[PDB]
Write a protein that binds this ligand. Structure first.
Ligand SMILES: Nc1ncnc2c1ncn2[C@@H]1O[C@H](COP(=O)(O)OP(=O)(O)OP(=O)(O)O)[C@@H](O)[C@H]1O
Ligand SMILES: [Mg+2]
Lengths: 49, 49, 148, 212, 198
């Protein structure tokens, strides 16, 4: 009967001393937004062997 | 000395071991150790077959 | 049992080849010609048509063989011309079925020298049809055009 | 002799960095994920080379820490080379409730599988429902639309805690999940029966927690 | 084991910092003397080190280094906004020949603001701020704010260096070429850059 009182009172009265934990939050790797793929179209022609 | 005790008090693992008295905690830990050893013995016996 | 065989390889609008078809041999096929003629290019076209995974394809020079280089350029883009391109294989199955696998290749407009691949397969094609003619349209006086 | 690994690096550290598990783990760790006992591969790896990893990461001005419960995590210093961030108060409410749920022997029979509804029911049983509703919307007074909005925010924050490694969803059902020991960090303000103010001061001094 | 030169490279005191930067997406140009020299010296091994993350270490033909993630990247990815590429292509255009005589390499925020407003079409500007907007002062103020914001993002990427004072005047680095057009034999850079901007 040790933690019941210990933890319940903390949740019940949290807003009298609100506190927050710290975490590692390394940056995301920025990349180019992919534009719509634009292929090369040229209607090539030539003499057939 | 007080500092030492204070230091240690935080380091308790979970509820069944929440004896706020470190020295008292020791034995509980060791109890766990023995428990675990028995479970390991049974599991390795199962593994053989 | 009769093992399957590769009948032929076809290239369209590659660097130096407009529309060419090599007929493979049952045992050995040899390519000869002076430096820069285009032999290694033919090899590259074949392997590309076999494994279109663009993450893997990496055509190093024969010199510098075996050196894991991570080169900026994989060396495929330059072997293609502007517009649409093809690379196809004709295969005779052990069941004596004619199947044509291949890929459509196309350069990507933009600073990065990227390439686009779209595989395809054809089954049941009549034995009288040649891939060179199937992939081109006769426009004008013997001045054929390639079709997407 | 020259051109010898020992000149530049301890052999065990190089051996660790060359392992196939390292890139995954590194990536994750940097992202803030906690590592518990269930993900054996990772955990075991951590255990094997603990001191080398600690020494390594030290270069970055970050502590690789081991909680008593057996879970590893990253704590950045003030001079950290890697950014540091803080959790929201709703995340704390859900965190402390998940902690009480883990301890509860009354629900141990579930074999760790809990449902979002049970979590929500426990939370409203303990905290001030109508006063907590203030965080969802400044005009909330017990309306069902607002109650569903609260449930959806809980659903969202719980998903964030999953990315942190604090809870694992079932393989085929997303309405049910399992807890891990990493949740005990939410009890860092009460694990010792002492003056709350002094505890809080100690925590902020250690870099564990910030006020709001 | 591990290659000796790779162990040497990552043992160097400069590595942690550069690692941090690179993972963020920053581009290393010829300006950063020590970092650039370090990469030049240990490229052959750093490329292998980062390949283990399914991320590619590329040296641009102009000379600057940067990382490119694959689809299977181990590093969490993120993507720029449309307005970001618009501004980037504008900066690429400003890397012009008369620039040398016009500004001696040092620009101002107003140059970019006015260039952006003059050269872009109104429809995509509205799409940038909000479709409900129509030629109003508050919309232009919001667009200015967004321009400053994205310019700071680009400064993070290393594209643009702010002169060390509170005022918003800057210089453009060579790495801006990453936004640039494809170059074909004999083509004029101004024309091709404008052609894409259109
Ligand atoms: N990626 C490329 N970009 C530009 N030109 C290329 C590219 N790859 C090959 N070439 C050129 O295409 C021509 C054909 O080269 P290829 O290697 O296929 O010839 P080859 O007959 O096999 O020569 P060798 O026997 O000397 O290897 C050569 O002029 C080569 O310079
Ligand atoms: Mg060759």
């Amino acid at each position: 009967r040790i933690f019941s009182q210990r933890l319940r009172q903390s949740v019940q009265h949290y807003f009298d001393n609100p506190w927050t934990l710290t975490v590692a939050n390394a940056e995301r790797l920025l990349d180019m937004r992919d534009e719509e793929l634009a292929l090369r179209n040229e209607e090539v022609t030539g003499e057939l062997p | 000395f007080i500092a030492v005790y204070q230091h240690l008090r935080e380091r308790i693992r979970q509820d069944i071991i929440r004896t706020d008295d470190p020295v008292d905690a020791i034995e509980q830990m060791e109890i766990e150790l023995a428990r675990l050893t028995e479970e390991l013995t049974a599991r390795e016996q199962k593994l053989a077959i | 049992i009769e093992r399957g065989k590769f009948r032929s390889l076809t290239l369209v609008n590659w660097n130096g080849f407009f529309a060419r078809t090599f007929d493979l041999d049952e045992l050995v096929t040899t390519l000869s010609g002076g430096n820069g003629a285009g032999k290694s290019t033919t090899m590259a076209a074949f392997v590309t048509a076999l494994i279109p995974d663009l993450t893997l394809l990496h055509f190093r020079n024969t010199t510098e063989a075996g050196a894991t280089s991570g080169s900026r350029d994989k060396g495929l883009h330059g072997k293609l011309r502007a517009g649409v391109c093809y690379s196809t294989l004709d295969v005779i199955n052990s069941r004596h079925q004619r199947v044509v696998v291949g890929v459509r290749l196309q350069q990507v407009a933009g600073r990065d020298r990227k390439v686009d691949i779209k595989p395809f397969m054809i089954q049941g094609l009549p034995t009288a049809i040649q891939p060179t003619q199937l992939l081109t349209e006769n426009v004008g006086e013997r001045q054929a055009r390639v079709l997407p | 002799s020259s051109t010898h690994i020992e000149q530049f690096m301890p052999v065990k550290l190089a051996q660790a960095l060359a392992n196939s598990l390292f890139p995954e783990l590194d990536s994750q760790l940097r992202a803030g994920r906690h590592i518990g006992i269930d993900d054996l591969d990772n955990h075991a790896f951590l255990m094997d080379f603990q001191e080398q990893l600690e020494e390594f990461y030290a270069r970055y001005n970050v502590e690789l820490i081991r909680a008593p419960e057996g879970f590893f995590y990253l704590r950045p210093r003030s001079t950290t080379l890697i950014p540091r961030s803080v959790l929201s108060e709703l995340d704390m409410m859900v965190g402390k409730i998940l902690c009480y749920l883990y301890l509860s022997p009354e629900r141990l029979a579930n074999q760790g599988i809990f449902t979002s509804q049970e979590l929500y029911e426990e939370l409203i049983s303990l905290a001030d429902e109508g006063k907590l509703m203030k965080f969802v919307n400044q005009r909330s007074s017990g309306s069902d639309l607002d109650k569903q909005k609260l449930q959806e925010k809980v659903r969202t924050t719980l998903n964030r805690l999953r990315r942190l490694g604090m809870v694992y969803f079932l393989p085929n059902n997303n309405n049910k999940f399992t807890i891990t020991e990493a949740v005990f960090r939410f009890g860092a303000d009460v694990r010792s029966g002492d003056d709350p103010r002094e505890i809080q001061l100690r925590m902020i001094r250690d870099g564990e927690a910030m006020p709001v």
